[PDB]
Design a protein around this ligand. Structure first.
Ligand SMILES: NC(=O)c1ccc[n+]([C@@H]2O[C@H](COP(=O)([O-])OP(=O)(O)OC[C@H]3O[C@@H](n4cnc5c(N)ncnc54)[C@H](O)[C@@H]3O)[C@@H](O)[C@H]2O)c1
Ligand SMILES: NC(=O)c1ccc[n+]([C@@H]2O[C@H](COP(=O)([O-])OP(=O)(O)OC[C@H]3O[C@@H](n4cnc5c(N)ncnc54)[C@H](O)[C@@H]3O)[C@@H](O)[C@H]2O)c1
Ligand SMILES: NC(=O)c1ccc[n+]([C@@H]2O[C@H](COP(=O)([O-])OP(=O)(O)OC[C@H]3O[C@@H](n4cnc5c(N)ncnc54)[C@H](O)[C@@H]3O)[C@@H](O)[C@H]2O)c1
Ligand SMILES: NC(=O)c1ccc[n+]([C@@H]2O[C@H](COP(=O)([O-])OP(=O)(O)OC[C@H]3O[C@@H](n4cnc5c(N)ncnc54)[C@H](O)[C@@H]3O)[C@@H](O)[C@H]2O)c1
Ligand SMILES: Cc1cc(=O)oc2cc(OCc3cn(Cc4ccc(Oc5ccccc5)c(O)c4)nn3)ccc12
Ligand SMILES: Cc1cc(=O)oc2cc(OCc3cn(Cc4ccc(Oc5ccccc5)c(O)c4)nn3)ccc12
Ligand SMILES: Cc1cc(=O)oc2cc(OCc3cn(Cc4ccc(Oc5ccccc5)c(O)c4)nn3)ccc12
Ligand SMILES: Cc1cc(=O)oc2cc(OCc3cn(Cc4ccc(Oc5ccccc5)c(O)c4)nn3)ccc12
Lengths: 267, 267, 267, 268
């Protein structure tokens, strides 16, 4: 049990393809006791989370809702029991309106759209850490999901901007989390076919979704020295669990790349 | 005449200490014909800009005002004359509310304040390029001001997140501007005593402002192999002019460090 | 056991303070079956390895001796039993002559000395992977020890160049290892009081050794959001074991920073 | 005053053919008023014919960066060429070499250290040894510029030259620490691909039958990646970037890398 006895809050399950679903599955297989947070369709998410290896309380969390955030630690504490604290927090949340993605012109995305995406995808990492650090044990770990935004790329558009914001937020979350003996890190994952990829990325690409996703999949697997499988979230979930474990105890404010080594190779 | 006969739009002048004031001064000393944009205190900005080596048309430009941005190209064309286009555009604009700066807790900055800062400091780089690219000549150059946000640091707080988003925005503006034969780059300057430093950073640092700024100047100057004088914007102004000129014609989506070499040295 | 049943080669032990000694100890506490390699003071190394939880075979390996490298895989197979292969390889080797370190002028290190340092510290990562890759199992992992060379610093001098070379070598060794299903990563560790730190770094600093090392420990701990203990190799050793495990299976050609997050913070 | 490098005395090393990056650096620097001192290696009679194709006449000095005597006499020979009492305002290092075993389709692991070490000596250590030799005859406000090819990520064919470029980048950061004492800047120009003798003879030669396909993929792929396009046949943009660094217009940039690659390294 890599996470045996650890109490871990995992956010971001929307379907069984979600990276958070696989983080939760691997974490439960490794002995973690989970609290899950879901957004919007809690009744559908409930149905999905029933397919996880073990039962886990499901709490509603809209990161844009200040009352959900203010009552969060209290709702987590009643779910895990008084006296118990969290050892891990998984932020696997992202959003960007379709206007800030795909073939929609980069300059045409209104700031209202971009700002909502930045709020959910980047600011929410600080807001979740602010709400959960008061109930985190020393030695704990906060992990957020990133997609390497160091270079501009096709389709990802304003989400790349949101991920660059996220990386910077992570380094500041590490400064605040250090006061609690808590580490804060991002897992920069390769492309995994999720509902976000299909509905947000795919949908915003339209006529170009097929070619772009094919080129992304073939190019990523070629670039990755050990290959990359866009339909297998397990290596990403295992990396998130390594950061939640006690086996990366000196890493904070950082980014672990679970991308097959793709970011290290030009071609 | 490094910028001889170039029509250059310079935004960001508020006082004679502004980085945009020194860029405007150096650019005019190099033969550039300027169009200056100012925000909020245009009567006072007219007084400051009257101190430049040559008088230049001053236009109002609030980067949050959609009408100012939509009318920008037409107002510039009216200033430079029909049939003329801009060769350079300088974005030297930044803002971050007090809550997102200094000794005020990072976690206590509301997203409304952070979003306002990201709008002005990062999104406006894309909205200014979108407004001005249709009126820019091939071979042109768009330059924005950055402050190395790759590592977290005391006091800079959410402005670091805005600069990280700005760096990502710049890489996407480079893609769009490339279609016009225009380069887009950021100049990451070392610290310079401007109104933004004293009023925004210093204001948010409270009683710890004098010591933190003195510590920053000494540290930066010690780390920089060629030294650093935060009272002198000229080295920074010259670096922006090098980017506006045809002497860096193969550089786009990039950050040029005008910081004394500080970011290349640990101690 | 995180490394249950894995056969791992650990090079680089000279004293019980060596980072490789703690990597070997932690790997053995986690079920790894080790094969140890040592250089020059084999008798001392044998006494040192007698302090490890389990007595592992000790193999002579001077990384500048082509006979030792050409016979390495055969000697390793004699040690771990024919029919058995390595699951992991740890490179924890470094050397730089005194002229290429400390207060000795950077410009005065003769190339013969710098080349020796680069050969042991950087090229040996590729020569070790070349010898051991044919006897490594798919899923295997090669880990090297690095010290963040992205920025110049005092005293490290030509060893910073050797580490920059090593980071590049690591990225190519990942291209080669990838075809065998083997990962290749580096652990950029924070400062640890080892024999190399006192004899090589401290030795080259002269009478400035205590003050410089005291400043390094204080500065590193100050910068690390989770703190840093120069007398504690265990967090570093734990990180190397995480890379040797199946829990980072999508990371290759990469660098994981086991430095307390110090590289992500300016101050 | 009249030219970006007016009145500056600049040493330019690395000219071998008129396609060399150093040749175009020399040409553009002379076009901007720089008085040059050129350095050449091995084929000095052939190089003298190449250096006569430049806009203005410049002295040509022999310099094998692996030769202690050429380095020890260098500042003296430069002082003789520019006149005593005059100093260099710039130094350009556009030198590189890596034996075939360390390049192309030759297996990365089979490159012997003797070969790799020669390449790192010529391509990375020499940047420090040239600075050590020329900093004592450089003026405050001076500038040392070296040539780099972005080694932050592994790539096909570049193999051990990537390792030398990584070492060079780290050397440049330390050369900045030393040059700073003299008020001199030290930077690299990470240029995009340019059709030079090194590309054809060393890279192409090491690529064997894959030379044409890899060069065509490199050429078109870089142009595509670069938001402003990239012309592998035009070294002028790179030459202008080196002159920009040798000028007084990047006065606060040291120990750094300026990318003259059309922006390609910023795009995935
Ligand atoms: N799928 C990939 O290839 C990939 C790669 C790298 C990083 N990521 C990151 O992984 C994370 C999860 O994405 P995914 O690919 O698993 O997709 P997904 O669609 O399964 O997950 C996105 C999640 O964000 C949640 N979310 C959106 N708005 C929210 C709000 N206001 N409040 C709370 N939750 C909200 C959704 O409910 C959903 O569970 C995101 O941060 C994403 O950017 C994904
Ligand atoms: N001063 C430094 O040390 C330093 C260092 C690195 C980068 N920078 C950057 O330089 C730029 C200019 O800052 P400065 O230091 O010269 O300070 P400054 O106060 O002189 O400049 C900031 C400018 O932003 C303008 N601005 C604010 N909100 C705006 C809006 N809504 N629309 C249009 N303009 C708006 C202000 O009117 C002012 O002219 C900023 O991007 C800043 O982050 C400054
Ligand atoms: N100590 C630190 O603070 C620190 C920090 C980051 C990285 N590192 C790296 O970790 C590694 C281990 O060093 P350490 O700090 O544990 O010091 P150490 O003195 O314990 O180990 C250095 C080892 O290198 C071996 N070595 C030297 N020349 C060799 C050769 N020719 N062939 C084979 N082995 C050879 C020595 O025998 C010794 O075992 C080195 O690569 C070092 O640069 C150390
Ligand atoms: N050509 C490109 O695409 C490209 C791209 C980026 C960087 N670079 C770098 O630019 C520099 C110049 O290369 P180039 O492309 O102009 O090729 P080139 O063949 O024209 O120049 C290489 C030069 O190095 C010289 N040299 C080799 N060994 C030497 C020694 N022992 N002493 C002195 N000089 C020596 C050669 O004589 C020649 O003048 C090299 O450092 C190269 O790595 C080239
Ligand atoms: C290199 C490359 C080659 C190519 O041919 O095409 C590309 C297309 C790309 O851009 C589009 C994209 C990003 N990804 C990975 C992902 C998918 C879902 C994510 O979750 C989200 C959650 C909310 C909002 C938006 C996204 C996410 O953050 C990352 N897949 N598709 C990126 C790179 C290339
Ligand atoms: C290393 C260090 C040591 C130390 O003791 O203290 C520090 C304080 C720092 O953070 C505070 C800061 C940043 N600077 C530089 C600047 C000043 C004005 C800017 O303009 C703005 C425009 C709008 C909004 C906000 C700022 C700007 O973008 C950057 N000066 N003050 C950063 C680093 C250290
Ligand atoms: C910021 C700072 C302040 C200060 O006052 O002083 C410093 C000295 C530093 O540079 C010197 C150094 C590096 N370290 C960490 C290490 C120690 C041993 C290693 O092993 C080796 C094996 C073979 C050869 C050389 C070293 C090693 O690779 C890294 N400790 N000392 C770096 C930074 C500062
Ligand atoms: C992106 C990409 C796509 C692709 O399909 O293929 C590639 C092949 C590459 O690697 C091979 C190479 C590097 N270049 C650029 C150069 C050419 C000459 C140089 O000068 C030297 C001086 C002495 C010794 C060796 C080289 C030099 O430093 C860099 N041209 N060929 C690199 C990148 C790609």
């Amino acid at each position: 049990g890599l996470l045996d006895g650890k109490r871990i809050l995992v956010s971001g399950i929307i379907t069984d393809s979600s990276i958070a679903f696989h983080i939760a599955r691997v974490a439960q297989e490794q002995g973690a006791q989970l609290v899950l947070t879901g957004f919007d369709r809690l009744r559908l998410i409930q149905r999905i989370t029933d397919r996880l290896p073990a039962k886990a309380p499901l709490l509603e969390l809209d990161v844009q809702n200040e009352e959900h955030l203010a009552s969060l630690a209290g709702r987590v504490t009643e779910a895990i029991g008084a006296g118990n604290k969290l050892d891990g927090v998984v932020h696997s949340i992202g959003f960007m309106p379709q206007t800030g993605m795909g073939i929609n012109p980069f300059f045409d995305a209104p700031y209202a759209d971009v700002s909502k995406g930045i709020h959910i995808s980047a600011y929410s990492y600080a807001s979740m850490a602010k709400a959960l650090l008061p109930i985190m044990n020393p030695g704990g770990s906060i992990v957020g999901m990133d997609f390497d935004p160091s270079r501009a790329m096709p389709a990802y558009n304003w989400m790349t901007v949101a991920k660059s914001a996220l990386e910077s937020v992570n380094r500041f979350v590490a400064r605040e989390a250090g006061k609690y003996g808590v580490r804060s890190n991002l897992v920069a994952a390769g492309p995994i076919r999720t509902l976000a990829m299909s509905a947000i990325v795919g949908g915003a690409l339209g006529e170009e979704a097929g070619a772009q996703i094919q080129l992304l999949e073939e190019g990523w697997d070629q670039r990755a020295p050990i290959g990359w499988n866009m339909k297998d979230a397990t290596p990403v979930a295992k990396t998130v669990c390594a950061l939640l474990s006690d086996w990366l105890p000196a890493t904070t404010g950082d980014i672990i790349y679970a991308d097959g080594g793709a970011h290290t190779q030009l071609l």
